[model samples]
Target: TIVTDNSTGNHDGYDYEFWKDSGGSGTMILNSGGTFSASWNNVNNILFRKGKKFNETQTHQQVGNMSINYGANFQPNGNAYLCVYGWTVDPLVEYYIVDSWGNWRPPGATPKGTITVDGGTYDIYETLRVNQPSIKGIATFKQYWSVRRSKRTSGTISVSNHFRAWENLGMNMGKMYEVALTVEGYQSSGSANVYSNTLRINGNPL
Candidate 1:
């Protein structure tokens, strides 16, 4: 089912930062081979041209539980990731994907199992990042992630539907505050490009 477009303001700059919205939900094309260097606290080597954030009760619902049919063609470095992420309220949660990277892992967690999304199996990993940048003062929440088992250059993902699998494992999906797609790097040099990417929201939120 073709869902609504959730595109937002897109950005690309340099700095050492965390989970900042890079609004652009419709096909992003970029190449950062020599636009920036390493030892910097910034995401200067990315062109985040697709993502969105919405407030809802759970991860299930027609449009709210949409599938992300997208793909990217980029050169992978050992210190970066091309993926999506977002923040939630109350418990102050954050979730992301390490779409294509040399090696990846959560801040402090290990892969629990395999989750199949859109017929693609992902390596599940859960962790907690303390002190989030939410409306709430200081807070912490668990981060549930599904890293693709094979590092393919592009593919699709059932973002919201994976929540059910996590919930069955004792994880709770509270009021979802916001979600966005992003490309981040650390000690990364040169330029990286995202040839194409498209995000589709599953079902309509009630």
Candidate 2:
């Protein structure tokens, strides 16, 4: 089914969300096996993801090692990201482990540091947003990022590696709200087709 609004549900044992701001518009088709395809135009912000949600007590490590395999054709007109994206409460955080992008890379400046994991090098970044939109409504929060130096459409992300690295850097995260594989676009027009997606946490399929 093609959903064209802000919505969320569980499909095939995986949680899926399609979210956009008032200025954004998009279409998403949810498939079995936790996969979906999405396209967006003139978006202020749009995100679609599939994964698992937690009870707001487990941290990322407690959530276990998260990994995803996906394929996409991302347009280059606007800013976009294919990533492992998620949120945390208490401290209220938004995080990303970006593997692929369109037009421009994130943070668009020098990184706080770098880390090598999963056979790849990623630049780390931290940004604070004061009173912005989030899963918990308009609020202030921190954003943690790990942007891969190299971009690819299809691959596996060692999601826990980034989590560990972030904690080591004193980037404390609160209890988990969700951990998801996401595609996001900002202030642009673009389309992405996520052909297939598989997620595993702690050596077990989720």
Candidate 3:
């Protein structure tokens, strides 16, 4: 959805942003690439088209340097999905996509791939890019913590859903997951309770 920045006096430069589900019933609002000055008309009477929102349950997800074994008993169903918001058109509109490994790859820098591990080894996804314009990033993993769910960290421009989720939306969408199975960050010893709520599920589309 192209959210309006009520902060902008309905005129002047517009704040560009997009949004979508976080996999566990959470809404993730994202920003578009470039900021626009509201006057950049879609060539007069530009028909602002509204699209259907992709709805789904969004659970908080995390990928680290631990397990990426293609066949790891670690289930990957309804597990987690990524949503990326980007620039689409004039008037500072926004667009979104899935599997954004945090703009690390090109062709829009939104490619999808899985880590392969074998032999008592796990193919974990490393390098969490909470990208900044002038810096590398605080390594949030190959995905992004929905600024809507976590913090608006990806520079001052976009709302990306990259390595953020482990989605198989098609024949790949898995059900029954063992979430928080492998944990990391902000803990004393890899021991932090992962959170999931069916009601506080506000903002998400599922």
Candidate 4:
């Protein structure tokens, strides 16, 4: 589901389904004009995300040294974010991420700690997903990492290190499930592209 045009409806084609919440609009593209890029746009919308999810299942301890390399280009808007995010099941689904929204905290959520990964300092947060849909008919607390002013347009990240670090903060990783890369739109409206989105994981799956 590579979308290169403007959209108000949902679709799927690549390895993940593209979606947007209520009252939002954007474009999702896997490659536009001969570039290794997947783009998302949310023009004049409130808070909602336009992105993709890679569906898989693995364990925490089994996941060792996971790495993903990618580049991001923010275009035509000041309020949209290119985020590296995922969901895991600690017997329930929880969301995790490195978002581009600087200094923004999840509502009613305060900083627990910061974890230093390969590229930048990530502010950690824990909050509930709140009425979100799930494959197992469940929604619960989510742990996320917001990178501090890194403006990370391109880099390789240690995904497993994040998990391990979260465990150190009392958020133990459970059965790893969903992994995603998204361009979340805030009040700002514009188009953004993610280039060279490559993911590699080492270790056995349970």
Top-lDDT candidate index = 2
lDDT of 1 by residue, 68-158 (tens): 5555545535455656666554445666665666445433367787777665677777787577644466566678777776666566656
Of candidates 4 and 1, the better by lDDT? 4
How well does candidate 4 score on lDDT at residue 163? 73
* Candidate 1 positional error at 89, Å: 2.2
For candidate 2, the per-residue lDDT at 117 reads 82
> On a 0 to 1 TM-score scale, where does candidate 2 land against the true structure?
0.94
How many angstroms is residue 177 displaced in model 1 relative to the true structure, after the best TM-score fit? Answer: 2.8
Q: Please, what is the whole-model Cα lDDT of each candidate in the order they appear?
A: 0.50, 0.85, 0.20, 0.54
Per-residue lDDT tens digits for candidate 2, residues 23-107, read 8579989987778888888898899898888889887777777777666666646788988899999899999999888878897
TM-score order of candidates, top first? 2, 4, 1, 3
Could you tell which candidate, 1 or 2, scores higher by lDDT? 2
Model 2: residues >4 Å from true position, as ranges?
none
lDDT of predicted model 3: 0.20
What clash count goes with each model?
Answer: 24, 0, 25, 2
Residues 5-115, model 4: lDDT tens digits = 434332332244344555545555545311234333444432223333334466756655666666667563555555656566655645546545423433336777888
How do these models rank on lDDT, best leading?
2, 4, 1, 3
Better of 2 and 3 by TM-score: 2
